[PDB]
Write a protein that binds this ligand. Sequence first.
Ligand code: HEM
Ligand code: HEM
Ligand SMILES: NS(=O)(=O)c1ccc(-n2nc(C(F)(F)F)cc2-c2ccc(Br)cc2)cc1
Ligand SMILES: NS(=O)(=O)c1ccc(-n2nc(C(F)(F)F)cc2-c2ccc(Br)cc2)cc1
Ligand SMILES: *[C@@H]1O[C@H](CO)[C@@H](O)[C@H](O)[C@H]1NC(C)=O
Ligand SMILES: *[C@@H]1O[C@H](CO)[C@@H](O)[C@H](O)[C@H]1NC(C)=O
Ligand SMILES: *[C@@H]1O[C@H](CO)[C@@H](O)[C@H](O)[C@H]1NC(C)=O
Ligand SMILES: *[C@@H]1O[C@H](CO)[C@@H](O)[C@H](O)[C@H]1NC(C)=O
Ligand SMILES: *[C@@H]1O[C@H](CO)[C@@H](O)[C@H](O)[C@H]1NC(C)=O
Ligand SMILES: *[C@@H]1O[C@H](CO)[C@@H](O)[C@H](O)[C@H]1NC(C)=O
Lengths: 552, 552
Amino acid sequence: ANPCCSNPCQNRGECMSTGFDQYKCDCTRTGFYGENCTTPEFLTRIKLLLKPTPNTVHYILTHFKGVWNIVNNIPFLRSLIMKYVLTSRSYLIDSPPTYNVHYGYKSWEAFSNLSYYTRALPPVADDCPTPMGVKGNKELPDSKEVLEKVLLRREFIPDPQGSNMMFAFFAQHFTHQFFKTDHKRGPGFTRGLGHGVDLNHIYGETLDRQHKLRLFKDGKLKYQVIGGEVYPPTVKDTQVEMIYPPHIPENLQFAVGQEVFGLVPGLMMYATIWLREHQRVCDILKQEHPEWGDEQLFQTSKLILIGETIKIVIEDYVQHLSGYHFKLKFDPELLFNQQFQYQNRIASEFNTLYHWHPLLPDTFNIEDQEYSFKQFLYNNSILLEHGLTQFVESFTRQIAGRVAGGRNVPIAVQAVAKASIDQSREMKYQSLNEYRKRFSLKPYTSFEELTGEKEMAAELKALYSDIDVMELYPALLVEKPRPDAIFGETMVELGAPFSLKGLMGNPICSPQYWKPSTFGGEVGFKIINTASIQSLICNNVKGCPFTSFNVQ
Amino acid sequence: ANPCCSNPCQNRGECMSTGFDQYKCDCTRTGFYGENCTTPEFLTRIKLLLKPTPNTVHYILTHFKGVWNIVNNIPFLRSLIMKYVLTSRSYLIDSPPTYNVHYGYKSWEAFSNLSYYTRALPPVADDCPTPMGVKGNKELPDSKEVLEKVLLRREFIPDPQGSNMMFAFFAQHFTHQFFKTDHKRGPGFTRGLGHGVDLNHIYGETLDRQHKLRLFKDGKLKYQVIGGEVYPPTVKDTQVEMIYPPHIPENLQFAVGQEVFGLVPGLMMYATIWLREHQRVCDILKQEHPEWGDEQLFQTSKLILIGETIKIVIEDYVQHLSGYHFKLKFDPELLFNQQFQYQNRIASEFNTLYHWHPLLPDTFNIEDQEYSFKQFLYNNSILLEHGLTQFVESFTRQIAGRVAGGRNVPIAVQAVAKASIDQSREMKYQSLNEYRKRFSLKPYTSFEELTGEKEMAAELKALYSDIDVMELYPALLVEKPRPDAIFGETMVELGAPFSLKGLMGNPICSPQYWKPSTFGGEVGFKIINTASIQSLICNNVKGCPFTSFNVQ
Ligand code: HEM
Ligand code: HEM
Ligand SMILES: NS(=O)(=O)c1ccc(-n2nc(C(F)(F)F)cc2-c2ccc(Br)cc2)cc1
Ligand SMILES: NS(=O)(=O)c1ccc(-n2nc(C(F)(F)F)cc2-c2ccc(Br)cc2)cc1
Ligand SMILES: *[C@@H]1O[C@H](CO)[C@@H](O)[C@H](O)[C@H]1NC(C)=O
Ligand SMILES: *[C@@H]1O[C@H](CO)[C@@H](O)[C@H](O)[C@H]1NC(C)=O
Ligand SMILES: *[C@@H]1O[C@H](CO)[C@@H](O)[C@H](O)[C@H]1NC(C)=O
Ligand SMILES: *[C@@H]1O[C@H](CO)[C@@H](O)[C@H](O)[C@H]1NC(C)=O
Ligand SMILES: *[C@@H]1O[C@H](CO)[C@@H](O)[C@H](O)[C@H]1NC(C)=O
Ligand SMILES: *[C@@H]1O[C@H](CO)[C@@H](O)[C@H](O)[C@H]1NC(C)=O
């Protein structure tokens, strides 16, 4: 019924019904006029034939290593390169946020309610003829059919970028502070009201919890020592609820903060690492401010870790995951002379694309051993037994899967991947193509173009028929990998804008927060500006095991 | 004990202990260096001897009416004038917010916790020798002594600006959506998590309430009709809790939304006006979108009213209250090419200065009658009897007090005014002077300079002794009124920055919200761009009573 079901407003115009069987587009500040916001204004023309493609740019970044090893050394030049990368993507996200699971129109409720994940593109009018508006059939491909045919892994496909387990587990631990779906409420709801890098996964979603986890001495986090090593406190000492099956030893039930990190030794490995870092910085602070009381030591430390987290994720993580030759930089001071909103709301679409289950191996080899998922999941032992050292070692050495390949989802994780396909369906999402145009990408004209091959392409066409009905999630796991890389064009273009906003748009990166003072002196500030995934391990893991997010 | 108790960091540097009896200032981006951020950088010098004073500017605004009646007609020129007024003050507020009741240091908790009012200047170290840090005595002047001697009204002092009751009641109704102190938690806490112009006073703080107040038909708000006139629903029909003494008739207990607006016929007057406006726009929308369902009609309407509210508050309210000759303008598009944070957190200091009880008359004359507070407070009748018409008439005609005069607080309200004095004391505030330098004002050198007279000046000196110990609240109600105006310099300079942020920094003023679409077409957009305190009354009050925030 609803006239905008056909998604007729191009170039970002907005669409509203005007009388049952009529609509109108709002090309306000699109740069295009006319009925559907298509005919561009002169200046738009001028810049359009000038805009290099994300690909015809990704080349540049990955190439000319020599040139980059010049720019990368002219601090003047570097920050200049990084400011652009930092700025350009930003125009793709709405701040303040707009639509949500239940509002295809703006509303105050959408904006107000922090319990919802935001949404880069409105849902599909619940009264539209087809699941993507008007295109396609009454129903959409059997997800199970789609799962098996193109997603499920056959032979393990390694990652062409060398992304080890340190990476795969880091990303799962990190992103799980903001992606926290309130399954009681539904897909669309989140329990991460902090909507960003707030280290809630470490400290607690609530003050209640946060206190349950606290030592209240030296500003330190509560903890236990098993065999001379520091591990999280128990779910019986602190009284913080955790998700552990009944067949789990008291001493096994680690507390930590994020209620779910106990179900996978990968998680709890990093948990114990940060839990050590907190305490570490606490010491670095106490004897820098012997006169400080508990709270400040705590609250300050929590601030510095949010700094580190961001510095690592931008300088190690993203650096690797991009394969760019240009050396990314975390420098709040680059956005200062720039328009920018120091606020963030996490979108469903960002949660979705981040379902990188493919990264997961077939087994978890902690060198001199091999575990089936069945036995890795929520196990006390494995960590206690191997310890952080021979775990950091065993994992730096272990390649991960490839996301944008095709057929790489471990069968174990198959239930999940399906859910992802049939949940995004729940949240009435739009076509892979609508999301592509939404992010300045040209629509795919054939599944064949999408995959860049035809075995799968021809299969998808069996299922969908119109490429303009290919779903966003599957497409991301299938799509032709950018050169010798792990992701496709879409996966990179939607997610980068989202990723940098939630990183840069964090209060501590605002001009009134970014200063020696906010963190307890020049000291705790440097801790933030000299952080690296390596230092994090060297400092908090027994012998300094060398590490990298790359398989060496 | 704490070394920063002496508030030694000038020009906005930050201060932290460095060892029990030692501190350090952070002049980061102050423009001043040296131990206490006092010696300025060249450019600072350059701009300082160029910076015209708020007074040596307020003159300009109020004067040359001829010139202004030229600028005011050159749309090019006008918006150009308004952009500056809009921008200049902005640099005085922190976004994102920083300190709070319990944090004199930044912390994440300060930033995260929406239950706290923000705070333009940190509290005083609970371990400082005196109430203002180091200056003054172990204790501070008996508040009661101070109240009586300089605050309590003797002979009613009218307002030199002609601010009628329409103004006084409007401001009390309006600002009571954001100022909502959580007295259960304490001074410092708020129940207005929306921290701004969200019309929660109309729709409800929670969805639960919002739903109890809703018709769920045509998008309309629930309501009753007593004698052919539209008044809010009953606390028995809707089940929304309100504050009414037991000796209050069923039909008297109006619902409305803000749980306290029932205790004063002034409030409920405006309550009934907006409740009518909502419904009004709902109609203007339904036959513009016959195909819309309830929710959108509701949600859209709520969006339009937040527009109106802001348009009025900027173009009538502030315009009047400023006496400026320049015609203020509500134009979101002026901040577009400007750096600006579309977010807001309400500070204690803003709540405080806004305690304009002086505005209140000695009696409430609803023409051909006169009421003592005792009988105006929480009365069904008065409104039901006189009606909105002979209430709007009776109030346009009725001058209000003068805030920055001295001795003008009605004795009735004396309890309140005292509290204000001894609550701000609870929230360990800083000197009137620290708040002055904080907002770029020069410190007063004598109570005599403060008041601009000596009867009160000499009395205050009896009580305080050091001018640098004069409290912020009292000073605001005492201070020499700017010319033939209602406020002092402080009252204008602290509050303007606060006032424009919470107005401009509202999502609906962001480039992606400010468009014909967000409000249901060009129609409901014009409703926002043609709003005025007059139209509001003409449209929703029986015969169009003329109105003004000025006593004519
Ligand atoms: C350690 C092995 C892993 C297992 C067994 C696993 C299992 C799951 C399960 C059961 C869910 C929730 C099911 C649902 O979507 O309704 C989930 C969600 C998710 N997983 Fe994994 N996962 C693993 C590793 C990873 C990794 C390495 C990543 C990559 C970042 C990842 C990213 C996600 C994301 C983004 C979600 C959604 C989070 C949310 O909405 O709460 N997972 N995973
Ligand atoms: C209708 C008569 C009025 C009465 C009887 C009254 C009464 C009160 C009371 C009892 C309080 C709370 C006491 C406290 O501070 O702890 C209060 C707060 C306040 N009043 Fe009034 N008031 C009236 C009119 C006004 C007017 C016209 C203004 C001018 C804008 C005003 C502005 C304020 C402000 C800003 C607060 C603080 C709001 C908050 O923190 O929640 N009042 N008033
Ligand atoms: N080797 S690749 O083509 O697959 C590839 C190329 C570029 C990127 N990239 N670059 C950046 C930055 F440098 F701008 F920060 C951020 C991301 C990024 C980070 C997280 C997500 Br989720 C999505 C994108 C990532 C992968
Ligand atoms: N006649 S006066 O000297 O007392 C006077 C002069 C200027 C102002 N003024 N100007 C502006 C604006 F135009 F910039 F918006 C806002 C305010 C304002 C609004 C609310 C509060 Br609370 C405080 C200030 C107010 C009074
Ligand atoms: C606008 O788009 C609609 C739906 O996509 C289509 O029917 C119409 O022909 C288009 N008109 C123009 C002028 O682009
Ligand atoms: C957000 O929306 C959900 C569902 O609409 C509701 O249950 C929840 O109470 C809302 N949150 C708030 C703070 O109103
Ligand atoms: C737990 O880990 C141990 C040690 O690696 C392993 O032998 C065992 O299979 C696991 N226990 C369970 C119940 O899976
Ligand atoms: C800085 O202020 C402190 C405390 O008010 C004082 O001891 C010191 O002499 C001042 N120094 C300068 C350079 O202003
Ligand atoms: C805010 O802080 C107060 C005191 O620290 C606490 O009691 C309250 O629960 C906090 N609010 C939230 C939403 O955490
Ligand atoms: C309520 O208002 C009426 C009408 O103005 C007045 O006569 C009466 O005194 C008030 N009633 C009470 C109980 O105060």
